[model samples]
Target: DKLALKGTTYGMCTEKFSFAKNPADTGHGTVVIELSYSGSDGPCKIPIVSVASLNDMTPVGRLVTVNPFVATSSANSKVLVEMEPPFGDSYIVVGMGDKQINHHWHKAGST
Candidate 1:
């Protein structure tokens, strides 16, 4: 007889959120946004926006805005957006179970 083993792997993701600035503000330099998430893991992949023409990606965990800036001169200055992995779904499961057994999961509350 052979023994079967199975398990699940968990992960997370994140992104940057920007607020529109008033026309009076000036400072068209590179802007860096730092984000952090709380969970049962570390060293996850975060999405980064190196140019101002790119769209902002979605985030997974609790995102804290950090070190944002506004353009002081050029009206087309780009902003950088960043975030961790598991970028949208709070819970992710990867595993292999017995062929005869079925598994089920659900999110605790609203996202």
Candidate 2:
């Protein structure tokens, strides 16, 4: 199946949220998310990344809660996210401390 995500842009926005499926792995796959943080520069920052499934409110999975290495670079971080493919859709939410600032939507897949 071919899964896809639709979303807005810029700060922590995904340049590409791509998915891939194996021949036998019909119920699961993987997502490679490329995130770029291009905004007004500030002090050393640590970003929190999390994903949630849309169906009946469940968890997508946990990513590296805070990128220790990217604390000062203010650049981009590519992550390999793996989760149980939700029955419906999903969303990736980006946060700083306790506040969430960005979101991306992952739509249903196509066979």
Candidate 3:
């Protein structure tokens, strides 16, 4: 997903997994995301992408909803999420699935 806020553009990726019968069996799981907005200048200020879990959405989610909260700035100014399990590959979902969800924007008070 892509988002634009206050003249900045950000992106995020979420995935749902269903492990099939194999050496191990894990049920369905969802991965959340959180992005970093390191100030409004410098390369660090450039768009950053990160992952988070449902828990982190508490207070922020109440205002921005699941999608925006995950794509906006966080206190740490860095992406946070559980590390991938050893020997397992992570799946990434592509293409825009939700249209009602607006992910683009322009800077406020600027033309």
Candidate 4:
């Protein structure tokens, strides 16, 4: 998903969230997000992004937290994040700010 991080009146950012796969670990999948921010108020804070598989019982988890997750002012400053999720076409979750974004990843030609 491609999204803009804009508030009601000010602040703005952008992100591209996608899926990644690791062969060495065949039991899980990976979620990735590359993001940047350039807000009207300057820099971005709060609402640090996090990703994880959707389920009650699972071991796959978010691997990193984008601290200083501040996207450069507009010079192509970017950040990349990758997470591990359970196998199969399972649900995925992304937490930004106070909201949680949810979606599913279907294996190649398996949709």
Candidate 5:
């Protein structure tokens, strides 16, 4: 599935946009994202994180979980994500074990 947003941001941009809910945000707009891919491959997540930010996206502050997982053509335990059902316009960025997927501004009412 896809991770969703639910609130505003640093107030450094346009009108505050609610994407996902983060009780830890302390009422802030930033939410925690858990990216899982199940492999070992990458220079770092910061570059992709920066890219996501440029695309109006934010991620969980820390990164470190490069556990080994089975490799196959189809997705097994290495699924792209396991997220809550999307409600509205939830901005998401999927990260695989080796790389991060493109950013997405998931909208509502359109399958």
Candidate 6:
């Protein structure tokens, strides 16, 4: 999903979240978002944004101690994320935040 970010609130730093897959991956047809952050290298990188199948099982496992993992958005303040969403059609929160995004993508002609 497309979004707008205003870091003025979250300590002048902002992030996004979502669920995803690893193949040619039309996936379970879930919506998603991508998170990038301003980095010492530039304005979006590092701190690895991760996700669980049901959601929240960061790839790093229990090694890190971040309460509620989040990903920083690209310097331009743009990001996309993917996450575990529910089934059917009604609108729900797969990943929650100030954004309240989802990972389900309803493409054309699945009918």
* Candidate with the greatest lDDT versus the true structure: 4
Give the per-residue lDDT of model 1 (tens digit) for 3-110.
333334633222212223211112332222322222123333233222111212442322233312221132122333322222222321112231111112122336
> Which is superior by TM-score, 1 or 6?
6
Q: What value of lDDT does candidate 2 attain over all alpha carbons?
A: 0.39
Local distance difference test values of all predictions, in order: 0.26, 0.39, 0.27, 0.42, 0.31, 0.33
TM of each candidate vs. truth = 0.20, 0.39, 0.19, 0.36, 0.26, 0.25
How do these models rank on TM-score, best leading? Answer: 2, 4, 5, 6, 1, 3
Q: Pairing residues by index, what is the TM-score of model 6?
A: 0.25
Task: Pull out the clashing pairs in model 4.
Answer: 47-97
* lDDT score of residue 33 within candidate 6: 45
Would you list the rank order by lDDT, best first? 4, 2, 6, 5, 3, 1
* Models, CA RMSD each: 19.2, 11.6, 17.3, 9.4, 14.5, 11.7
Give the range where candidate 6 is weakest over 10 consecutive residues by summed lDDT. 60-69
Clash numbers, per candidate = 16, 0, 1, 1, 7, 21
Look at candidate 4 and tell me the lDDT of residue 100: 43
The residue-by-residue lDDT of candidate 4 on 45-82, one tens digit each, is: 42322223345365444444343235445523444555
lDDT of 3 by residue, 1-111 (tens): 675555456433222212221122133332323444333332222211222222223321111122323333342354433212122332222123331111211112333
- Candidate 6: stretches off by over 4 Å: 1-25, 34-70, 73-76, 90-111
Better of 4 and 6 by lDDT: 4
* TM-score of candidate 5 on Cα atoms, chains taken together: 0.26
- For model 3, what is the C-alpha lDDT against the true structure? 0.27
Tens digit of per-residue lDDT, candidate 5, span 11-74: 1111111224321221234323333333333212222321222334444322222211222333
Compare candidates 1 and 4 on TM-score and give the better one. Answer: 4
Give the Å shift of residue 13 in candidate 3.
Answer: 10
Clash-forming residue pairs, model 5: 5-19, 5-20, 6-19, 6-20, 7-18, 7-19, 37-97
Count steric clashes of candidate 2. 0
Which structure among the candidates has the greatest TM-score?
A: 2
Give the clash total for candidate 3.
1
